[model samples]
Target: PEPELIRQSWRAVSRSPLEHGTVLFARLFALEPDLLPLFQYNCRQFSSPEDCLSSPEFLDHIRKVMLVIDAAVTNVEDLSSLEEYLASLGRKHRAVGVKLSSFSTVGESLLYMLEKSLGPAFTPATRAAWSQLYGAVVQAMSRGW
Candidate 1:
């Protein structure tokens, strides 16, 4: 994806923080309700729209992830680092008893959330690109497990 495109997407997400974040959580919960049990009472920790949208940490995390993804997509040769990062993410997921197969659920949910939030702004080409990127991430993450 182009840097400007990625920047626009990030801006879209940052603009409607509550709505985007809620969509993310809603889609994730719909796909993997079992994971909800792990959060205990903290399930509603981000219940407030304001809380979800106003967090600098959340914004920073999203920016970092997007930047990493943009770099990985543009420079295929740097995939090793991306793979290593995915491996670490997978290890963290595994520590929570999240199986490799569960990532497909997460991916689908993510797409659903993005589509719902972005509407026509999320073109099919964009979706395809993101889907492929997500697949690579999942593959790399599950490689060692």
Candidate 2:
């Protein structure tokens, strides 16, 4: 996968912060409702994930999550720091019993969201890059576990 292309692709999505983050969580919950239990969203009364779209808690999560994702991508070249961060992240997930499948599910949902939101910007090259990027993330997190 092309490193520059990955960076450039995410850079484009960064321009649309709302859609970039919103679509990711939306797809994740819609595709796998079980994953929602991992999140501490108290909006349990909602009929569906889509119903929580406008909630302050959900939107705040989208904001923080997108920035964290952008930081990880920005530092993809810095393996040591990235690994450290991922290790800590993995530890937290592990503590909650988050499985490798969950990580994989999130990655797949993320890639799907990217393709949807980016449309033309999400070409084959972009897919290849994100696939590799998410692959690395899952692999690295496993190592930390």
Candidate 3:
């Protein structure tokens, strides 16, 4: 996987962080509606996708997810720098009841978001690069469990 292509593809998406992160999270919830309850703000669960996506706290959560991805992209050339942090992040997810299994759905939704956002520019090479990058991120994060 070419790091440049990964960075290249990420450039466009990162430029419009909130807009594209919204697409990724929306796709994620669409694929796994049950995961929505994990996102509680003020100890209250959202009633629906629309309800959840519209919430400020939930939106900030989405941004935080984007920031993680951004960090991965920033450290794409060498992932070890983010390893410890990602493990701690994964630990936090576990504390909140997010199963490791749920991350596969998140990965798929990620590809979907990239495809939708990049259209034809998201070539096979680009997809493969992102898949490799994401897999490494997850593998590092999986260490927390």
Candidate 4:
């Protein structure tokens, strides 16, 4: 679960986390439909979570999330710059209705996506590392957003 190992595992297991981010968002919406109200862009135009199956905003949102996730993964061990950036992002999210508690929901949804897609290939160490990183990000949100 260390940085070097975790980064290697992430790259090994996740061929393209950027693409996975889209499917991840799809699964998240399917898991929590009510949360869709938070989005006012293309996703908001959807009739249901399933309706966003091909929305442009889905791609946009996933892209945005993956940018942060990618950056975090790159600096998983060096959290110095990560926390600062996360705090600003959290503030941006807080400006909306992204409550601190929702971070856990997001985290679980993401983990579910990883585990479901990666299957046994996703090691316990990888899972713990990913969760810990997300935990740090969400904790920052708690303090700011």
Best by lDDT: 3
TM-score of each model, in listed order? 0.65, 0.79, 0.91, 0.80
Q: After superposition on all CA atoms, how large is the RMSD of candidate 2? A: 3.1
Candidate 1 TM-score over all chains jointly: 0.65
Q: Which candidate model has the greater lDDT, 1 or 3?
A: 3
- Alpha-carbon deviation at 85 in model 4, angstroms: 1.5
Clash count, predicted structure 1: 0
Over the stretch 58-118, how does candidate 3's per-residue lDDT look in tens digits? Answer: 7788789889999988898888999999999889888888899888888898899999998
Clashing pairs in 3: none
Worst window of 10 by summed lDDT in candidate 3: 40-49
lDDT value, residue 91 of candidate 1: 88
Off by over 4 Å in 4: 12-15, 41-55
Off by over 4 Å in 1: 1-8, 14-19, 41-78
Return the clash pairs for model 1, or none: none
lDDT of 4 by residue, 1-145 (tens): 3787557656743567666776677677777765776674335657554566457766677777777777778777776777777788888888876777777878888787777767887788878888998787777657675
Worst 10 residues of 4 by lDDT: 40-49
Writing each residue's lDDT as its tens digit, candidate 1 over 1-145 gives: 3434434545566556555655665677677876555444222446444464345644554455445445555554346667777788778768757679877876787678677767898888767766776777788889647
Better of 3 and 4 by TM-score: 3
User: Which of 2 and 3 is ahead in TM-score?
Assistant: 3
Give the local distance difference test score of model 3.
0.85
Write down the worst ten-residue block by lDDT for model 2: 40-49
